[PDB]
Amino acid sequence: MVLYFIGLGLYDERDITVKGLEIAKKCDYVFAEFYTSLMAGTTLGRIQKLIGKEIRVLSREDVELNFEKIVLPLAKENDVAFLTPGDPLVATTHAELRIRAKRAGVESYVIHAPSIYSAVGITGLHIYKFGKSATVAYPEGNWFPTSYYDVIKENAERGLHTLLFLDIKAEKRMYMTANEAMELLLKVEDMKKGGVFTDDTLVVVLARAGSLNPTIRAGYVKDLIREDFGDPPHILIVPGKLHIVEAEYLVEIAGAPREILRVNV
Amino acid sequence: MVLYFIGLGLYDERDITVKGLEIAKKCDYVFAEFYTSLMAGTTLGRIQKLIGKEIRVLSREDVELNFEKIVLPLAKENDVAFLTPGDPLVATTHAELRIRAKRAGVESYVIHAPSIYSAVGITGLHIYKFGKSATVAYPEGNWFPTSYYDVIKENAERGLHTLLFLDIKAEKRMYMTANEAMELLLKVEDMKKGGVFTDDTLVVVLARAGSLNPTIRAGYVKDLIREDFGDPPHILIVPGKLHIVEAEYLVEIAGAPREILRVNV
Ligand SMILES: Nc1ncnc2c1ncn2[C@@H]1O[C@H](CSCC[C@H](N)C(=O)O)[C@@H](O)[C@H]1O
């Protein structure tokens, strides 16, 4: 009778909310997609074991083109769940699927889960200070995406931090590292020369949020661009002007150069 | 020797993650704070029964002034949990507590949970389009703060959405309603005349996010200002120019008038 969109969280199968788990366990059919993000600390098997249900994984094509043919038909006479990494409606286009559900006469409900969008709070940067977000996409052929550079410029001008989601090519098992994102940004900088992203720019890297020991590092691009931040997923952040407490946390917790403690007010 | 910052999530006792629950259950001591926000869909008793541990609630003073006197001494020789509504470290004052832990020679780990910051994705508005966030504070005496109005102005002129956290008197457990926020914003507009918030402004109200039955409503201030959005908590969003997909979700899912499809896109 219903369709549930349930987030699985940041890193492993235990990042699902108790609410989401109890609801999933009682659903008749369970579908899921693992192309919008990477849960580096679990496997399909462990997720299936926790929920006690077989999980039918769908590809991007299955979802975007055939969601109404694969999932919705069952939701008309059964309780169906659609699982996704992190929060199902953050930096995905899954919200549109609720419209398809409605038009198909299917009621849908959303169960949230920890998202990287809010988890960056662990970097010590004030969440309210984050401005517009952007995605660093892999260049393809003659096409080299650069909109994310303008976003950083716009936020920085306002003293706001910029969250940069990094690209993912699930089927090819490609996960953009913070290092690759920094390299692309330097290239865009040489092209636009806006002084937005250089070797002297302070950046923050958060890798495998959700795990108990995520990698949290802050420093200048010149020093971090070749640093090993561990396995993906990674997210890159370009902070705006720092408040004293933000700088203190980056130094004490993220190993940033003590010199950033001296904010230029 | 270990302190766990564990998020309780959005609304009720089941919004904690499985990871958070299992870790909390094994902790020797469990503390909690309910001053950064509240858990409107549950009670201390229900949270205690779920975790199966006595929970010592701490006031803002207990934490800000005495975190190292009350919590850290126990964390030095035991496993201690510190529960917070939402996702830990979204609240600005949380981060610094990890530095206190470090100074006391205590290891700390963060267990994330859903935050309203990311849960607003259920409004159908693209997460990347949210700019700087702000809090609408109740005016009192001769004090009439209005910085949140400027935040909306700066975001909107850049085509970005503005997430407005509404004031809460945690201690007294009194919540500002979206209606009161709209009244205040109209009040501020009449004083600043910036043309930022008027009867013709399109707003989105999200009430009781996390619940299976949150109220999601979109429409013009003139129509929503006296509407009943149900019990707290309420969140108010002033969207910037909309992508057609965002507008269609607001119409189909949030009952927005068809007019937004031609006026706000
Ligand atoms: N645990 C994690 N650690 C670091 N980055 C993460 C992450 N989970 C997701 N990301 C980042 O976000 C991108 C996916 S965007 C989809 C996000 C998801 N709906 C959520 O709510 O988190 C990844 O390519 C990566 O850059």
From Swiss-Prot, chains A, B:
Q: Name one Pfam family in it.
A: TP_methylase
Reactions catalysed according to its record: 2-[(3S)-amino-3-carboxypropyl]-L-histidyl-[translation elongation factor 2] + 3 S-adenosyl-L-methionine = diphthine-[translation elongation factor 2] + 3 S-adenosyl-L-homocysteine + 3 H(+)
For the protein in the UniProt heading, the enzyme class is transferase
Q: Name one GO molecular function term.
A: diphthine synthase activity
* Record-annotated membrane-spanning stretches: none
Which BP terms in the Gene Ontology apply to this protein? methylation; protein histidyl modification to diphthamide
Task: Look up the record and name the pathway of this protein.
Answer: Protein modification; peptidyl-diphthamide biosynthesis
| Known partners and oligomeric status | Homodimer.
The record makes one more remark, namely:
The diphthine intermediate is not stable in vitro and readily eliminates the trimethylamino group. It is not known whether the elimination reaction also occurs physiologically.
Task: Cite the PANTHER family for this sequence.
Answer: DIPHTHINE METHYL ESTER SYNTHASE, DIPHTHINE SYNTHASE
What is the similarity comment for this entry? Belongs to the diphthine synthase family.
Q: What is this protein called?
A: Diphthine synthase
